[PDB]
Coordinates of C-alpha atoms and ligand atoms in Angstrom, one line a residue:
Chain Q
X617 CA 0.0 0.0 0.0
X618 CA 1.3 3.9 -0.5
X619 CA 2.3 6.0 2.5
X620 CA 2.3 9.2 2.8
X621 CA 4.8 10.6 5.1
X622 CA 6.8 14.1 5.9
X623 CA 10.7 14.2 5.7
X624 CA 11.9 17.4 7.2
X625 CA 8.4 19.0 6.8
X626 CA 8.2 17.8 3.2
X627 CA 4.8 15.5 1.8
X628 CA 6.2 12.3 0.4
X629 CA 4.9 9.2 -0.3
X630 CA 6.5 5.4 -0.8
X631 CA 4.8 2.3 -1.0
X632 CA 5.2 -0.2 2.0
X633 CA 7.3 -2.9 -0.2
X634 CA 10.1 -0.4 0.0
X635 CA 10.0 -0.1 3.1
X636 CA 13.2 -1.8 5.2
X637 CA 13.1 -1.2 8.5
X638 CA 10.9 0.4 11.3
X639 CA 10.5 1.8 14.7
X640 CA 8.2 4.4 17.0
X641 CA 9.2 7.7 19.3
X642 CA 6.3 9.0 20.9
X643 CA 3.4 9.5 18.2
X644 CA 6.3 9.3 15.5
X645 CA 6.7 5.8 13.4
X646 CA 10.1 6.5 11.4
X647 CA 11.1 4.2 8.6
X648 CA 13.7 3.7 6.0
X649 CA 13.1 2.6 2.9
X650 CA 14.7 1.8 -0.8
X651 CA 15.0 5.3 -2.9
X652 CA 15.8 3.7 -6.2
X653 CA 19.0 2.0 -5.2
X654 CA 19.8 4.4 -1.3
X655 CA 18.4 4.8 1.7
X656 CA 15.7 7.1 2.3
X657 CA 13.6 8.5 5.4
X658 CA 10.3 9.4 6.3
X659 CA 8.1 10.0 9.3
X660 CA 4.5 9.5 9.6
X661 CA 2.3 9.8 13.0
X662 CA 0.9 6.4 14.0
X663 CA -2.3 7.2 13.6
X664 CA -2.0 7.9 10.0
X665 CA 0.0 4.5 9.4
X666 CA -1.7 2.2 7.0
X667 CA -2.4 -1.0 8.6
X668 CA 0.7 -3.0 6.7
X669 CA 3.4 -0.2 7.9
X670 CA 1.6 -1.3 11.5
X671 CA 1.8 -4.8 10.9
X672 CA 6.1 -3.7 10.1
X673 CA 6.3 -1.7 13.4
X674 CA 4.9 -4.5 15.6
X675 CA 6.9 -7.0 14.3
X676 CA 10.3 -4.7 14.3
X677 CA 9.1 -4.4 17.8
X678 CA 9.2 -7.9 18.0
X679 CA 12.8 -8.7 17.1
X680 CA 14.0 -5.8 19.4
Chain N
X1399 CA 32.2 15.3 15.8
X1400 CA 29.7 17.1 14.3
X1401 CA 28.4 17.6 10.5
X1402 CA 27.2 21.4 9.8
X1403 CA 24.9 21.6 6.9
X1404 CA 21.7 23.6 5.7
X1405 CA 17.8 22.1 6.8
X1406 CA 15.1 24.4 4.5
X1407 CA 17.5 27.4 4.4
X1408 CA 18.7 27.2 8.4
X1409 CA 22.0 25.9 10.0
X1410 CA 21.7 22.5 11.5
X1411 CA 24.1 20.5 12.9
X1412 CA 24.0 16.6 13.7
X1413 CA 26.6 14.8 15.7
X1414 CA 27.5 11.7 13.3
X1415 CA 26.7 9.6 16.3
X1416 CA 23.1 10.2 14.7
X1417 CA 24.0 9.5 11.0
X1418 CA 22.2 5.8 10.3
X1419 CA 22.9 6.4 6.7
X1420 CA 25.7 8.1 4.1
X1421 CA 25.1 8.4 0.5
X1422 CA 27.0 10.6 -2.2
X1423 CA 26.4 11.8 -5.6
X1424 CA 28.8 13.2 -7.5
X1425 CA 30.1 15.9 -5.0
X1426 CA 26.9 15.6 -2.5
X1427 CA 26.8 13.3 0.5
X1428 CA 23.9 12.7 1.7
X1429 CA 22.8 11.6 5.3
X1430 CA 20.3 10.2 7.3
X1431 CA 20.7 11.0 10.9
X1432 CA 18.2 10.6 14.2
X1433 CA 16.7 13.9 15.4
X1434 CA 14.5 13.7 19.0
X1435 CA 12.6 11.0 17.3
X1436 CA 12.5 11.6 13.5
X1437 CA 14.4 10.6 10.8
X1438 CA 16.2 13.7 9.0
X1439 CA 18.0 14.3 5.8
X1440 CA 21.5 16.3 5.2
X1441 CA 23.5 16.8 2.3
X1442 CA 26.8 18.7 2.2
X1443 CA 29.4 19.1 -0.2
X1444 CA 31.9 16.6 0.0
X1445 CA 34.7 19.2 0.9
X1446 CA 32.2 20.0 4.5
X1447 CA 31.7 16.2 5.4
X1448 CA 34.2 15.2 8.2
X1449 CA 36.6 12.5 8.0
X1450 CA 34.3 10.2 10.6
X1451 CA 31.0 10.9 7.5
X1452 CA 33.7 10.3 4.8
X1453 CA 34.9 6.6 6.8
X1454 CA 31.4 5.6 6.8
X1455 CA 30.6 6.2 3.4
X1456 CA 33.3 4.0 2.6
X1457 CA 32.1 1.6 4.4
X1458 CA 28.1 1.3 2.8
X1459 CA 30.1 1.6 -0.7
X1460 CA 31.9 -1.5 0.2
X1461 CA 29.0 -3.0 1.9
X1462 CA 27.3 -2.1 -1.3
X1463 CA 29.7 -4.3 -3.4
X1464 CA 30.1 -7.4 -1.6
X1465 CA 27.4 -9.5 -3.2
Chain F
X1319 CA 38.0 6.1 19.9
X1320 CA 40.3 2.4 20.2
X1321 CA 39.0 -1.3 19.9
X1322 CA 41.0 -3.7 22.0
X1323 CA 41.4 -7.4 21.4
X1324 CA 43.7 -10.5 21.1
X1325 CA 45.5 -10.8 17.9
X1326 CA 47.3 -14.1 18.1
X1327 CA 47.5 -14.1 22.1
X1328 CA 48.7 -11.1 21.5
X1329 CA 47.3 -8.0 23.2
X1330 CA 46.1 -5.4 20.1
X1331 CA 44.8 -1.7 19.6
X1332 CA 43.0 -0.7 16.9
X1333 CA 41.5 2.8 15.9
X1334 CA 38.1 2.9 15.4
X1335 CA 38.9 4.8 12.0
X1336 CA 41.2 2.1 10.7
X1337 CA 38.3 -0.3 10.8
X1338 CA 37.1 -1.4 7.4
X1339 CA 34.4 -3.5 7.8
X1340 CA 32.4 -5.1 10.8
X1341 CA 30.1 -8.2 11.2
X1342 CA 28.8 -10.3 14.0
X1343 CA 28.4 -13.9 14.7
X1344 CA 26.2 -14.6 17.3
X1345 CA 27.8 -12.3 20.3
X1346 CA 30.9 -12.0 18.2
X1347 CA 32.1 -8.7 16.7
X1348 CA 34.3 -9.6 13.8
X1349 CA 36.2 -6.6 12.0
X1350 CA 38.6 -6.1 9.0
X1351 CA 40.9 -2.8 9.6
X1352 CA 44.1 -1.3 8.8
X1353 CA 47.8 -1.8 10.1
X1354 CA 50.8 -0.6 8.7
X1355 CA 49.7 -1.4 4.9
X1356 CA 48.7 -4.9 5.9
X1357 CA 44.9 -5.7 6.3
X1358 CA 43.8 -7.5 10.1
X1359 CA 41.2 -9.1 11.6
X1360 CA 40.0 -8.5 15.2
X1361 CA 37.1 -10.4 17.3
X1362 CA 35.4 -8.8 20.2
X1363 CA 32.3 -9.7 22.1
X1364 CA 29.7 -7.5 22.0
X1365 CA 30.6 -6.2 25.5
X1366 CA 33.7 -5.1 24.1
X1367 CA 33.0 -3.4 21.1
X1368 CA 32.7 0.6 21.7
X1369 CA 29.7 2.1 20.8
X1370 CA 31.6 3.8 17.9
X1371 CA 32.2 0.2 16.4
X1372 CA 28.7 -1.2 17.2
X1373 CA 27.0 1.7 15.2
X1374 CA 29.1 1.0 12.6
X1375 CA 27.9 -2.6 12.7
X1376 CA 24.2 -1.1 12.8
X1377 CA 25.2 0.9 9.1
X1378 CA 26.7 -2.1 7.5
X1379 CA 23.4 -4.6 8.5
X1380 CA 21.4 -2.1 7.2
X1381 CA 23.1 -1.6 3.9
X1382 CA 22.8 -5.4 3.5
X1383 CA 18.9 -5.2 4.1
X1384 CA 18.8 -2.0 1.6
X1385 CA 18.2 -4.3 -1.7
Chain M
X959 CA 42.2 -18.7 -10.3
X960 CA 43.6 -19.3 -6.7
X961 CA 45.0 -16.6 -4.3
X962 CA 47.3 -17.8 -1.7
X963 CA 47.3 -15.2 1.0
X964 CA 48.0 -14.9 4.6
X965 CA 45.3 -12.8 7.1
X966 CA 47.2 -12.1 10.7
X967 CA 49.8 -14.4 9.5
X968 CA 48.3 -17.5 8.5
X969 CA 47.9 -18.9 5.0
X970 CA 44.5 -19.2 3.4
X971 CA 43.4 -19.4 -0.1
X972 CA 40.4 -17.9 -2.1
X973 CA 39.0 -17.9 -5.8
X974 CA 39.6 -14.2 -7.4
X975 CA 35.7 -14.2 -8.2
X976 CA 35.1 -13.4 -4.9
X977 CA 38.0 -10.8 -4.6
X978 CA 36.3 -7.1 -4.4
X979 CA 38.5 -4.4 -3.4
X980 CA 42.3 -4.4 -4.0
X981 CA 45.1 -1.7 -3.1
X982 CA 48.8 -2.2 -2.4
X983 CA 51.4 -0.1 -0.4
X984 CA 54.9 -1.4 -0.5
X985 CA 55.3 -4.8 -1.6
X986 CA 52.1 -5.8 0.0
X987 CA 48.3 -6.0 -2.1
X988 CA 45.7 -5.8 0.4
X989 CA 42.4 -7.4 -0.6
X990 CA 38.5 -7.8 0.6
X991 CA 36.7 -10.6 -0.4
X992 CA 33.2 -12.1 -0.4
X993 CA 34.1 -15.2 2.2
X994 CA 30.5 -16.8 2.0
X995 CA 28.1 -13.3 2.8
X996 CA 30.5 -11.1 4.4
X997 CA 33.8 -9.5 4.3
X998 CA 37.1 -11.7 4.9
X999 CA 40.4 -9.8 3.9
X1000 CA 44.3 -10.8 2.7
X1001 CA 47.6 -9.7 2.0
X1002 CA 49.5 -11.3 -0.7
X1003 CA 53.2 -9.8 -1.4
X1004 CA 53.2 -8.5 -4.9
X1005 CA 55.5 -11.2 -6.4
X1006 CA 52.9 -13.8 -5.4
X1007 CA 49.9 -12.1 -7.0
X1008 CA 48.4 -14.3 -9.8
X1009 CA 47.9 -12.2 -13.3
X1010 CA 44.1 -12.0 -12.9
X1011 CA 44.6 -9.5 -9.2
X1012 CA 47.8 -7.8 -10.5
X1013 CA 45.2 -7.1 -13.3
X1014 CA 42.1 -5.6 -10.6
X1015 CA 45.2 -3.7 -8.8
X1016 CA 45.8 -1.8 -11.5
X1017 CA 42.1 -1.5 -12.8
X1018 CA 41.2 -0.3 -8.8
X1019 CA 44.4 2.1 -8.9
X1020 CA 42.8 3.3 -12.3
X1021 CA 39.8 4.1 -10.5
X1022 CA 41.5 6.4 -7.5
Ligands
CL1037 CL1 30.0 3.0 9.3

């Protein structure tokens, strides 16, 4: 599914099968993900995680 | 050590500590650092990164080429 | 920032920016660096890797996990 | 082809397929290699450098 996140203030948006690895601060779920062959960023609030980029965190939570 | 660079026009500065990622393009290094609980983004010339940014860049290019 | 191990039975310091490459193995820090034009290898426990070191591990897991 | 080499002193040997990054100072060529999904590295003296790494030693010194 697509996300749409901020990075530094910005509107982005990725979908989740880029997405590499996960974690939570607060209200903040921060992720990085494949950028076309380099890392990239992004933060979106939980509550505006799709369920899939949930279904990462808890599992990244997991393995902590 | 610390890594000075612009964020939208004002002067940031990251401890590399923070950096969980180093990138370059042509000249540009670009980094990915932890910031009170979000992910930010960097870039500075390479002539502005310090030695400890440069060190790690060498390292995710050669991480980059072992497969 | 030094690393230091047994090299041989032999005790061994190693700066942190000489070091190549890092991997682990279980609770095993394995790590490639630099020394007098001659490429090493070091093993530490965890315990004994500097934070320095064990970021650098974090960097290189995660470039592996990039494709 | 075959690369004998020694790593802390003792001899090992590894296919040049899996060689990756190659420099020399003095009479020693440094190398990292692919040793089965992470890095292993090894010194060979010049003189005992097969054609085929000779050959990536100067293609990598090209490249600096
Ligand atoms: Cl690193």
């Amino acid at each position: 599914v697509k996300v749409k996140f901020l990075l530094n203030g910005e509107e982005k948006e990725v979908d989740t099968s880029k997405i590499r690895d996960v974690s939570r601060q607060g209200k903040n779920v921060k992720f990085l993900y494949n950028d076309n062959g380099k890392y990239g960023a992004g933060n979106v609030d939980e509550k505006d995680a799709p369920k899939e980029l949930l279904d990462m965190l808890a599992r990244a939570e997991r393995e902590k």
